[PDB]
Amino acid sequence: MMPTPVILLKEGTDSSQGIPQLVSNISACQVIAEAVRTTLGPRGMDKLIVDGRGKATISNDGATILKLLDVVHPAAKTLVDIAKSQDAEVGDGTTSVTLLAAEFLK
């Protein structure tokens, strides 16, 4: 590009456009699904998450695990949001929603 002595947007504005950003979004959703993947089924396993204060949370619940995870990716937050939605409306299947959405995207 060019320096453009006076610029349009504020300095530090990061923008990503096109196919690569969509592929990165799909990859982020895959990463989010991986973090709760092994909690599904009668043979599922618990996850332990420690916050800054030092308290540990152990849960097999997908929504709880996702909430304890502090996700900042704009596209990855959608999976956490739909997990919360499933927990609110139904209360069960919060792992299945994330797995299905990530599998669709993949």
């Binding site: 060019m2 320096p3 453009t4 002595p5």
Partner: protein, 106 residues
């Protein structure tokens, strides 16, 4: 602001009337310094170098070389006066005065 500054961010450019004003100001400053040299009724100038050497002179070229000036137009006029001294050996102060007055009248 300018095209050159856009290509080279740390570039100093004086354009349009600015260049003419800068050149005329430099020429007028040189002329103002060298006015007092002209004629047998001129005034001695004492020039002290960095090492502390004392030089008494009224020669226009000698004064120009020992002037603490770092200006482009001043450098051009100094080179012209140097050629004047080299070939004819006289008229350096008159050279500078005539150049400055030509620029002012223009």
């Amino acid at each position: 602001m300018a095209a050159v500054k856009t290509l080279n961010p740390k570039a100093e450019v004086a354009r349009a009337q600015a260049a003419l004003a800068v050149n005329i100001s430099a020429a007028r400053g040189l002329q103002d310094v060298l006015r007092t040299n002209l004629g047998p009724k001129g005034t001695m100038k004492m020039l002290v170098s960095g090492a502390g050497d004392i030089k008494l002179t009224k020669d226009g070229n000698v004064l120009l070389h020992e002037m603490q000036i770092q200006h482009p137009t001043a450098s051009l006029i100094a080179k012209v006066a140097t050629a004047q001294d080299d070939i004819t050996g006289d008229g350096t102060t008159s050279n500078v005065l005539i150049i400055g007055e030509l620029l002012k009248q223009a």
